[PDB]
Amino acid sequence: DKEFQVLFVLTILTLISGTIFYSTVEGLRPIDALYFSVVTLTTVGDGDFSPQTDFGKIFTILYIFIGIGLVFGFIHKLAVNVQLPSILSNLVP
Amino acid sequence: DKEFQVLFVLTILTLISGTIFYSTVEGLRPIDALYFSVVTLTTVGDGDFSPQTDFGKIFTILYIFIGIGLVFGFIHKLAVNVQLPSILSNLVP
Amino acid sequence: DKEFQVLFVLTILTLISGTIFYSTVEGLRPIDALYFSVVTLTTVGDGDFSPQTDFGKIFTILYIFIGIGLVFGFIHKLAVNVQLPSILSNLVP
Amino acid sequence: DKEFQVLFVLTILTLISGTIFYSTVEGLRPIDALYFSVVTLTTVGDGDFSPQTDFGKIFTILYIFIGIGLVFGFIHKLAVNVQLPSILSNLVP
Ligand SMILES: [K+]
Ligand SMILES: [K+]
Ligand SMILES: [K+]
């Protein structure tokens, strides 16, 4: 319960950092900087864009390292203790 | 047995939601909307396309979150209790 | 020991199927069809290309499902019981 | 403690090998070769570029195999025993 809330806020602040960086350093639109931030951390990736400034490239490097860990954690638990009991509850005869 | 069937139907409805959204909001061909839906959730990604409407971008965001969890689950078990005993059965002398 | 060899041959036959399909249906060069096959299953993805025939798109769909499971398994164990004792052996004082 | 340092240096040497290969064989700028090396191993991928020489393609193949294992290991533990106690320490009332 209080672990989803935590790993949620840490993901919010993580995504906030990226949206400000890319919307500032790389010149993306806020919504675009958010998307890029989301697709890189979940490792989906963006097919239409890549960081054009060496600054953006180095940030993205450290960003991926500090991020892939905590972003997927929220993906695991967002299901494990949230999406799961919700789907178990629909099965029960 | 009845867990593969479940995580299968939840993946069907998940993929259905995406195919309708992208084929409607982003204007992709049904088969294309399906592909995009599949490559984003398995995190492979699409190199030829990215959501062009801010609507599609936000949907994809929430879509990736609610999806990467249950899609890989079907990938894990589709093997664990299906692909595996099938390959163990071919080894037995 | 005999588990790396197995998950290795299953990955060989998996990669072989893809290289023939893409080099035939999509018209890629053998080496290119192999690369695409490798980057899609490890979920890295290809930024320069996507299946252009609906046949290639549907194959890739089923291909990703039957594949991401067994390809990463070889990635896990290729390290766990191969890359690891090799690196533990270099540490020992 | 001494396991983060290890999996860190193995990732440094891994990333070094790639940066030299791509900056030499594919003709990327050092910083670009590094980025590509990072995005392929974490499976994020690059949307703006793909290996253009068959040499680069085959290297990338073996590179992804020997790499995805040890790179994510550093991602797991970089959090587990580093990012985690750091975040647990901020919660304590
Ligand atoms: K990925
Ligand atoms: K990717
Ligand atoms: K592209």
UniProtKB/TrEMBL annotation, chains A, B, C, D:
Membrane topology: Multi-pass membrane protein
Cellular localisation: Membrane
The keyword Ion transport is assigned to this record: yes
GO cellular component terms, A-Z: membrane
Record-annotated membrane-spanning stretches: 6-25, 55-75
Annotated ranges, domain Potassium channel: 10-80
Keywords: Ion channel, Ion transport, Membrane, Transmembrane, Transmembrane helix, Transport
Molecular function GO labels: identical protein binding; metal ion binding; potassium channel activity
Superkingdom in the source lineage: Bacteria
Main location: membrane
Full protein name: Potassium channel protein
Source taxonomy: Bacteria, Bacillati, Bacillota, Bacilli, Bacillales
Portion of the full-length sequence here: 21 to 110 of 114
